[PDB]
Design an enzyme around this catalytic site. Structure first.
Site, short mmCIF file in Angstrom:
data_model
loop_
_atom_site.label_atom_id
_atom_site.label_comp_id
_atom_site.label_asym_id
_atom_site.label_seq_id
_atom_site.Cartn_x
_atom_site.Cartn_y
_atom_site.Cartn_z
N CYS A 37 0.82 -1.20 0.00
CA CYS A 37 0.00 0.00 0.00
C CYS A 37 0.87 1.26 0.00
CB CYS A 37 -0.95 -0.03 1.20
SG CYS A 37 -1.54 1.58 1.79
N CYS A 40 0.67 3.31 3.18
CA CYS A 40 1.47 2.62 4.18
C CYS A 40 2.93 3.00 4.08
CB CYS A 40 1.33 1.10 4.03
SG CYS A 40 -0.15 0.43 4.79
#
Length: 116
Positions: A37, A40
């Site tokens: 991600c 992330c």
């Protein structure tokens, strides 16, 4: 080069322990993440910073990889909305409290906890 190195990694066995053990003497903050991600990755340093400034505070700061096989487990029990999610486990709390996961909220979180 591991992802989010300052945070200790819970296993599925570990976090189901965290949720069932109580008389926790210490609060936890747990980042539900997934290493592919983009957000992330962009938050990674924000979480590493959170972990350093909370080290020795009594607050354990951990992460749990919540994609793949864990994804539905995390969706039903861990309040995983989307990646990343921040779970806060207080000492005496009915349930983990989902906490907003954007940068200034993390900075808000850190600095707040530092005045106890």
């Amino acid at each position: 080069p591991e992802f989010m190195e300052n945070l200790v990694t819970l296993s599925r066995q570990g976090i189901e322990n965290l949720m069932k053990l109580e008389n926790r003497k210490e609060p936890w903050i747990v980042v539900l993440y997934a290493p592919w991600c983009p957000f992330c990755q962009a938050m990674e340093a924000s979480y590493d910073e959170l972990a350093d400034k909370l080290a020795g505070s009594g607050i354990k700061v951990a992460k749990f990889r919540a994609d793949g096989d864990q994804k539905e487990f995390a969706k039903q029990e861990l309040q995983l909305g989307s990646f990343p999610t921040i779970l806060v486990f207080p000492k005496n709390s009915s349930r983990p409290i989902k906490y907003p996961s954007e940068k200034r909220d993390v900075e808000s979180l850190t600095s707040f906890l530092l005045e106890h």
